[PDB]
Design a protein around this ligand. Structure first.
Ligand code: CA
Length: 279
């Protein structure tokens, strides 16, 4: 399949080179996989989701995304126009309030929720979780992310936006999950992206067009935007049978575009997520 005039980040993850605008992908498009978006919620009624999104848990008075951030992330995972895995099922877990923040105890509960809830969902091709959130180092937050990954979910987490070593942030610093840094359309490390030996992979994170609340769209930036590119890529690859939840981060790193990014500090991987689709 080919989607012309796609958001630059979609075009980038199916290209060996920057500067193109068509997204190429196998038409299976993540069908039969599931991605949990653990964030501010998802505006499921948005037509861009085509009935494939649903809120499954909230820790607040409503399951509505009153912020937009979670809807944007979900759109990069799996919206029809802005998504990597255009046929995946999307499940929203609202651990962040409408101001975009959440207590670590609530975030931990939401991770353990996903580890159990996947047993209530039909995901024959596999399960992914996208965590575009984080704060300072917490062993409890890291151990929750480790449990989620151990349970058989491909966990993708944002590296953080501190232009610092991700070792000091959670869940970014949990070794066993897939920690995602951000790049821009000219293949630079995004100025704000964290780095360090705990990163597994980079994805597009600067000026990312996706869905927003009120049935809308907008472009925003962050490692929060890079993470769902990787989560959607994992779902896509698991539907194709190329990898599994336990192995997907390594598979993505093995098949990434290697050595092509700029402003990568010494000791940080120079790997950019790539779907290696050949039509
Ligand atoms: Ca890792």
């Amino acid at each position: 399949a080919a989607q012309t005039n796609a958001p630059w980040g979609l075009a980038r993850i199916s290209s060996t080179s920057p500067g193109t605008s068509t997204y190429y992908y196998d038409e299976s498009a993540g069908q039969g996989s599931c991605v949990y978006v653990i964030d501010t919620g998802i505006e499921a009624s948005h037509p861009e989701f085509e009935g494939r999104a649903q809120m499954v848990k909230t820790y607040y008075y409503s399951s509505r995304d009153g912020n937009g951030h979670g809807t944007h992330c979900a759109g990069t995972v799996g919206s029809r126009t802005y998504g990597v895995a255009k046929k995946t099922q999307l499940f929203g877990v609202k651990v962040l309030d409408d101001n975009g923040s959440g207590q670590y105890s609530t975030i931990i509960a939401g991770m353990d929720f996903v580890a159990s809830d996947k047993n209530n969902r039909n995901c024959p091709k596999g399960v992914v979780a996208s965590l575009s959130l984080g704060g300072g180092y917490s062993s409890s937050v890291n151990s929750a992310a480790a449990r989620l990954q151990s349970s058989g979910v491909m966990v993708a987490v944002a590296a953080g936006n501190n232009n610092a070593d991700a070792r000091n942030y959670s869940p970014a610093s949990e070794p066993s999950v897939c920690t995602v840094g951000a790049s821009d359309r000219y293949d630079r490390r995004s100025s704000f992206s964290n780095y360090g030996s705990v990163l597994d992979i980079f994805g597009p994170g600067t000026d990312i067009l996706s869905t927003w609340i009120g049935g809308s769209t907008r472009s925003i930036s962050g490692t929060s935007m890079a993470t769902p590119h990787v989560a959607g890529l994992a779902a896509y690859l698991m539907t194709l049978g190329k990898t599994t939840a336990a192995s997907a981060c390594r598979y993505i790193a093995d098949t990434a575009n290697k050595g092509d990014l700029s402003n990568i500090p010494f000791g940080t991987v120079n790997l950019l997520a790539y779907n290696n689709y050949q039509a």
